[PDB]
Write a protein that binds this ligand. Sequence first.
Ligand SMILES: COc1ccccc1CN1C[C@H](C(N)=O)CCC1=O
Ligand SMILES: [Zn+2]
Length: 139
Amino acid sequence: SGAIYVGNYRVVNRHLATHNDWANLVWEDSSRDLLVSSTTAQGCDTIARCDCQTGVYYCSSRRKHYPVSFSKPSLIFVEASEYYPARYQSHLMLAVGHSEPGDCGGILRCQHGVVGIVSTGGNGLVGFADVRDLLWLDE
Ligand SMILES: COc1ccccc1CN1C[C@H](C(N)=O)CCC1=O
Ligand SMILES: [Zn+2]
């Protein structure tokens, strides 16, 4: 679990979105595993606007933060789960690191702010759904 709170927006993994997220829907993309909903309280997370390929992510299955090198956002093949059939997920970044399904939502951050959230894993890899291209999250 985990979300990003910026301005009047809440960003979560689309497969973990609640009934309230869907009832206050702003934008969703199944191919990215992202959903954005509106909030009444004002969020104060900072979104990174950069091309960093190093950062730190929170891994709830280890109660630890790990420094990682990650790839640029891209179309990567993601095996079937109970939430999606096997498909290509877009805007995905991989790193060598630990990730279990319950780790989705953990934030990846660089010196400029929030880069994205955990979305995939397995085989000693961890995938992050990038949010750096969503410039409207700041306006
Ligand atoms: C070993 O599987 C994982 C490990 C870490 C995280 C996620 C998975 C598999 N997964 C990824 C899905 C997706 N994003 O397409 C959403 C739900 C899910 O459970
Ligand atoms: Zn950065």
